[PDB]
């Protein structure tokens, strides 16, 4: 499914309000991408389906630090 | 071992009928009710020991229970299997 690895962002529902205020049920989708990040610990590449904002969490943190929470949550990175 | 213990439960009842009586004098075959989950080797080994006679071959068939009616209740007889155990020339019973 469309679930971010780091942030955990999942699609949410809302209304597609028009100019006449007609409510139509839509779905907001996260900006997920399949990016492979270089990890200096294992000297390899780890591919993840993270969001674009999730990568902003990654670069401010450590790439090895964010994988610890993924390992703690029980995720196969 | 407990193989002889199983043979003591295979045999259930000695069947008797007009066809079964004719099998005795002409065909030299005993007809007797056996267990539902009884194989030909199990039936043969039971008659070999428990009856002290020589078994040549055993032919089995499953009798379907007839749907009876006890008044207004719709019942059904329990299914059973009969065996056609053929003896040899030196038969006793």
């Amino acid at each position: 499914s469309r679930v971010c690895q780091v942030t955990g962002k999942r699609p949410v529902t809302g209304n597609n309000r028009s100019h006449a205020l007609n409510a139509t049920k839509r779905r907001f989708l996260p900006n997920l991408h399949s990016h492979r990040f270089w990890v200096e610990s294992e000297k390899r590449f780890v591919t993840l389906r993270v969001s674009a904002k999730g990568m902003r969490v990654i670069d401010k943190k450590g790439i090895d630090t964010v994988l610890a929470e993924l390992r703690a949550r029980g995720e196969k990175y | 071992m407990i193989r002889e213990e199983r043979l003591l439960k295979v045999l259930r009842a000695p069947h008797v009928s007009e066809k079964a009586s004719t099998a005795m004098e002409k065909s030299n075959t005993i007809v007797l009710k056996v267990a539902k989950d009884a194989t030909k080797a199990e039936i043969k080994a039971a008659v070999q020991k428990l009856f002290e006679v020589e078994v040549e071959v055993v032919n089995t068939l499953v009798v379907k229970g007839k749907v009876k009616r006890h008044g207004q209740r719709i019942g059904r007889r329990s299914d059973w299997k009969k065996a056609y155990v053929t003896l040899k020339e030196g038969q006793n019973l």
Binding site: - | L8, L11, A13, P14, L50
Partner: protein, 63 residues
Amino acid sequence: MKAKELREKSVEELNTELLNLLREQFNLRMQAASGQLQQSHLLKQVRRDVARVKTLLNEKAGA
């Protein structure tokens, strides 16, 4: 016959219930089906005492 079979040896009382099946339990089942067994209470009690030894057989062996 709860106590008359309790302290008997394991394979000794094993031979009895294996004999139980070798006798009446199987003999009276042949006679009752042939219309020769007059008594009917014998078939009930023989089924009961076979269950009595097998309960003691499991009780003596192991737990």
